[PDB]
Amino acid sequence: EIIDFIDQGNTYAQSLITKKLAKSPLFYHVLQNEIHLKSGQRELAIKKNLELLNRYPNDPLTIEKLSDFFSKMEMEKESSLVYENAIKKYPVSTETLCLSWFDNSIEKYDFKVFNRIFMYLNKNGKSRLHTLWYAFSFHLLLQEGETDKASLYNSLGKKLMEGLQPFENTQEIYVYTLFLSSKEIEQVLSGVTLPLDLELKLLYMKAMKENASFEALHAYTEKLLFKEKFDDFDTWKLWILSGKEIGKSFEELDQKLTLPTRNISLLKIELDILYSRNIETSVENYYQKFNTKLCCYADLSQYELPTSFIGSLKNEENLITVVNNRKFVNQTDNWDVYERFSTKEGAEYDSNPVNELTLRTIVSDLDSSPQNTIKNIVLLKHLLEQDKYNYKLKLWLMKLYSQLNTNDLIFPIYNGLKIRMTQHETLNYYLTTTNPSKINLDAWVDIYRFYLTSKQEIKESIIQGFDNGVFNKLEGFINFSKRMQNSISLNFTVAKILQISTILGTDGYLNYFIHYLKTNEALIVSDYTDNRDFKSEWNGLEKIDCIDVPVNDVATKLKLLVYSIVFEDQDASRLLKVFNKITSNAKFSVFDNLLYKLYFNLLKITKTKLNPQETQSLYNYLQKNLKTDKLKILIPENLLSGELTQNLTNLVEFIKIVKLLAKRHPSSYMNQLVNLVKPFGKEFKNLKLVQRQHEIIDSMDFEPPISVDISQTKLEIKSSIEDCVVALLNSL
Amino acid sequence: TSIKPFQMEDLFELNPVNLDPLTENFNVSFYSQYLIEWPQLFYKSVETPNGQASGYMMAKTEGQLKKEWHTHITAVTVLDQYRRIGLASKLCLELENLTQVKDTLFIDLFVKVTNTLGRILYEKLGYSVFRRVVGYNKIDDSVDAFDMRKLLP
Numbered sequence: 001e002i003i004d005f006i007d008q009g010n011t012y013a014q015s016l017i018t019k020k021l022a023k024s025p026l027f028y029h030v031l032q033n034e035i036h037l038k039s040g041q042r043e044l045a046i047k048k049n050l051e052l053l054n055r056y057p058n059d060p061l062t063i064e065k066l067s068d069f070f071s072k073m074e075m076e077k078e079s080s081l082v083y084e085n086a087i088k089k090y091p092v093s094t095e096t097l098c099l100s101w102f103d104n105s106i107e108k109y110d111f112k113v114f115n116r117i118f119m120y121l122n123k124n125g126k127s128r129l130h131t132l133w134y135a136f137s138f139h140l141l142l143q144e145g146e147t148d149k150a151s152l153y154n155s156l157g158k159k160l161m162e163g164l165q166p167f168e169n170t171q172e173i174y175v176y177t178l179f180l181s182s183k184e185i186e187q188v189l190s191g192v193t194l195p196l197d198l199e200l201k202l203l204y205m206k207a208m209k210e211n212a213s214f215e216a217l218h219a220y221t222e223k224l225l226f227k228e229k230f231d232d233f234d235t236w237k238l239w240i241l242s243g244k245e246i247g248k249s250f251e252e253l254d255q256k257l258t259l260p261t262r263n264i265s266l267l268k269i270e271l272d273i274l275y276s277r278n279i280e281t282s283v284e285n286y287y288q289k290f291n292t293k294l295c296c297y298a299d300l301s302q303y304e305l306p307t308s309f310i311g312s313l314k315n316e317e318n319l320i321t322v323v324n325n326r327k328f329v330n331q332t333d334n335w336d337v338y339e340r341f342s343t344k345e346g347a348e349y350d351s352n353p354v355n356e357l358t359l360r361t362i363v364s365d366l367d368s369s370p371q372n373t374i375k376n377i378v379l380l381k382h383l384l385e386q387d388k389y390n391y392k393l394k395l396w397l398m399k400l401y402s403q404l405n406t407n408d409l410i411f412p413i414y415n416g417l418k419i420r421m422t423q424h425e426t427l428n429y430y431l432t433t434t435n436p437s438k439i440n441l442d443a444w445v446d447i448y449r450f451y452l453t454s455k456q457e458i459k460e461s462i463i464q465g466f467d468n469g470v471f472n473k474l475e476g477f478i479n480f481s482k483r484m485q486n487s488i489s490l491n492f493t494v495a496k497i498l499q500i501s502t503i504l505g506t507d508g509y510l511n512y513f514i515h516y517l518k519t520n521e522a523l524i525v526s527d528y529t530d531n532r533d534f535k536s537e538w539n540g541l542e543k544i545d546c547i548d549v550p551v552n553d554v555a556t557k558l559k560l561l562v563y564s565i566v567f568e569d570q571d572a573s574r575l576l577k578v579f580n581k582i583t584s585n586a587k588f589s590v591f592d593n594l595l596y597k598l599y600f601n602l603l604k605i606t607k608t609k610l611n612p613q614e615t616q617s618l619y620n621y622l623q624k625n626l627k628t629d630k631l632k633i634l635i636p637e638n639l640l641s642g643e644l645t646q647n648l649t650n651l652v653e654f655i656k657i658v659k660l661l662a663k664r665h666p667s668s669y670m671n672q673l674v675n676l677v678k679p680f681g682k683e684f685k686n687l688k689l690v691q692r693q694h695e696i697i698d699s700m701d702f703e704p705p706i707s708v709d710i711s712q713t714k715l716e717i718k719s720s721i722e723d724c725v726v727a728l729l730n731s732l
Numbered sequence: 733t734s735i736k737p738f739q740m741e742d743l744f745e746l747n748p749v750n751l752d753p754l755t756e757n758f759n760v761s762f763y764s765q766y767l768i769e770w771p772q773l774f775y776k777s778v779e780t781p782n783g784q785a786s787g788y789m790m791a792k793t794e795g796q797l798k799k800e801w802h803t804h805i806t807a808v809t810v811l812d813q814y815r816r817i818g819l820a821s822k823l824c825l826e827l828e829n830l831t832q833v834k835d836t837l838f839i840d841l842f843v844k845v846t847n848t849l850g851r852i853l854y855e856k857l858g859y860s861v862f863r864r865v866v867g868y869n870k871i872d873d874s875v876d877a878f879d880m881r882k883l884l885p
């Protein structure tokens with residue numbers, strides 16, 4: 001196997017090592033030989049691997065590689081037939097073969113394969129567990145939408161589960177319900193002698209409601225609420241619903257609502273609505289009990305509040321009472337309340353409720369002008385001095401910084417929030433504008449190691465969840481894995497590592513991530529999933545059109561194509577076609593449209609075979625536009641806008657790639673492009689982008705709404721702009 | 733509040749809770765382990781009107797001498813908007829309704845010795861300090877803790 005790892009890493013000693021090893025021999029080495037051919041040329045390799053398939057390999061490693069090879073060539077027929085032929089030929093190894101098949105198949109969420117594996121495993125299987133697998137896999141398939149197979153899939157799963165009666169636990173019962181109507185679910189769950197879990201209780205109540213079984217549901221919910229201390233709002237609503245349906249009076253229901261709990265106080269509103277009565281008194285009663293609670297507004301504002309209740313906006317001592325009242329009247333001018341409660345009090349790790357009001361005031365004031373952004377940066381930092389763990393203020397502070405060339409200053413906030421593991425997948429994008437430093441590069445690699453860790457942990461979770469019976473949770477493990485496999489946050493992480501690696505001269509990381517791209521081309525070219533969190537900084541606020549972190553999802557894909565093409569050794573034309581289709585529909589700024597046209601012409605000239613006239617046309621466009629007089633359009637008219645360092649960072653990376661290709665593919669026209677980029681650093685420095693930004697900042701006047709020091713922030717922002725911009729200019 | 737079973741994909745929508753500075757965000761494997769081994773003891777609170785998670789409970793059962801079992805609370809947290817209305821107390825009390833928990837002898841938990849807040853919370857729920865224990869990212873785990881117990885019927 002050691003010789004095989006050298007072959008993978010590549011490339012001439014590989015064919016010799018296999019020529020020697022195979023000359024000693026057996027099917028494995030021939031599979032290797034024909035992979036090495038595929039690494040040289042492929043039409044032979046498929047014929048040769050097809051030749052191997054028919055010899056019925058009978059060895060697990062050789063089967064795995066074959067099925068891997070055929071799947072790599074979009075030959076799903078053959079990738080499955082290797083295992084099926086082995087199971088057919090050697091049915092005593094059915095379990096072992098099927099589990100290897102399954103463990104290797106998980107990454108590729110082909111529920112037809114899962115169900116096919118489970119079919120073989122259940123035929124040569126004396127296993128209740130395996131029957132459950134097979135049955136559950138029919139539900140998985142049903143979640144894909146070949147509606148013409150749906151009736152069959154549902155009938156096969158139902159009948160497999162019926163074969164396992166009597167049921168031994170709530171997981172098996174759950175699986176059965178996946179193939180049942182609402183009518184059947186009620187009938188089944190009403191006869192279960194085992195105690196139901198929460199999952200099945202909720203399913204039982206939903207079924208009764210759908211069947212209009214309002215006697216059975218009123219009785220059932222009443223049991224949960226009045227005898228089993230559940231105290232569940234959704235269950236309370238079903239209880240009053242079914243109560244009315246079976247003819248109970250309003251008074252009959254309300255007389256049982258004696259405890260002044262939160263859920264019952266809200267329910268009284270829900271009960272007025274249900275009986276076409278007036279909302280007012282029960283809204284007032286909830287407010288009197290809960291106005292000192294931060295929940296009050298969110299609980300009431302979901303109803304249509306009478307204008308009389310809101311009219312009590314006249315003239316308080318309890319801070320949270322004031323917070324709710326200011327929310328009810330949607331008042332955005334709240335510094336007066338801040339001045340009365342600026343001091344953090346209570347538990348040290350609690351946020352100060354005043355900053356629910358101040359954040360609303362700050363968000364309403366945001367107008368995207370750089371003076372307004374800097375002013376509100378000063379206010380956020382000031383609030384965070386006393387309210388040190390308020391995450392919403394922290395997230396917004398990063399968003400504001402993301403509007404400027406202060407790329408230095410976001411990572412300390414992100415890391416002070418102790419983002420780790422899955423939070424990187426959802427919050428990553430806050431680091432979009434961070435500067436290409438070595439410390440940031442190492443942080444990004446650390447983020448990538450989370451991705452490596454999560455990939456292996458969720459795979460094992462899926463294996464253990466199947467081995468244990470936990471069908472209640474399995475679909476969520478599988479979907480979690482799927483959503484993580486090719487997310488925009490993962491690909492941004494790789495794109496960002498590559499960019500900083502090439503801007504700095506650090507080739508240590510570059511070779512690992514180039515190898516990821518060539519390994520996962522099919523994903524790089526596919527559509528990415530999006531699990532980013534654009535909501536948490538709005539929790540308890542109404543989301544409005546405000547400033548955004550400046551993500552660019554199409555550029556992320558194109559960056560990965562760029563690197564994939566640069567390091568393509570056989571045929572780049574397929575990747576350039578994807579590149580050109582994407583740029584044709586890309587939705588870019590003027591500069592980004594030019595950048596990726598420049599990239600496209602650069603890669604076509606260096607990585608494809610062109611006649612001399614095609615070469616000259618593509619190269620002439622690079623020659624005319626690799627000039628500061630053309631590239632100045634990367635400079636925004638608002639010099640303080642973060643787009644300046646974003647575009648400049650991309651220009652620097654593009655020039656590094658020009659130089660890389662000039663080495664790997666020397667030509668007179670590449671040496672001329674290397675020559676053309678030489679004066680960029682001098683020419684961009686002479687534009688004095690730092691000084692002009694410092695002058696605009698010093699000319700800005702500030703009338704902050706509270707007592708703050710602007711000075712310390714102006715200096716930190718000017719120094720950060722300088723450090724980040726000068727690092728880029730010296731890198732041209 | 734309503735209570736719902738926790739599912740893995742809830743992890744993607746938990747930042748309002750898990751960005752709290754005392755609320756750890758664990759590895760995928762740790763969350764999934766609780767869902768695999770004690771799936772009923774990992775549930776979430778949810779609020780009207782959008783079904784947003786207002787908090788969650790992660791608990792487990794654990795065997796000793798293993799002729800004698802107990803339940804253990806590993807994590808309770810409540811979103812800031814829904815604090816001081818007994819939601820944490822409700823999540824802890826709901827354990828006592830689960831038959832898997834009722835079949836154990838007691839519920840225990842660890843509170844840091846400096847967390848006078850948490851001790852009182854659990855004391856109000858019927859827990860009492862049983863024993864001080866040694867300790868050894870967001871929380872310094874080297875700080876001593878109180879194991880607190882509540883005997884079950």
Ligand SMILES: CC(C)(COP(=O)(O)OP(=O)(O)OC[C@H]1O[C@@H](n2cnc3c(N)ncnc32)[C@H](O)[C@@H]1OP(=O)(O)O)[C@@H](O)C(=O)NCCC(=O)NCCS
Nearest residue numbers: 347754755808809810815816817818819820821850852853
């Ligand atoms: C500790 C925490 C989970 C409590 O949640 P909650 O839903 O607000 O609490 P409850 O309404 O059920 O309150 C119960 C009690 O603990 C205490 N308490 C809870 N939060 C309080 C705070 N910030 N300050 C002073 N006392 C408080 C009380 O003395 C009290 O009872 P009361 O009803 O007579 O006021 C919470 O505020 C938070 O940090 N969530 C997750 C992180 C963490 O610190 N972990 C777990 C607990 S040790």
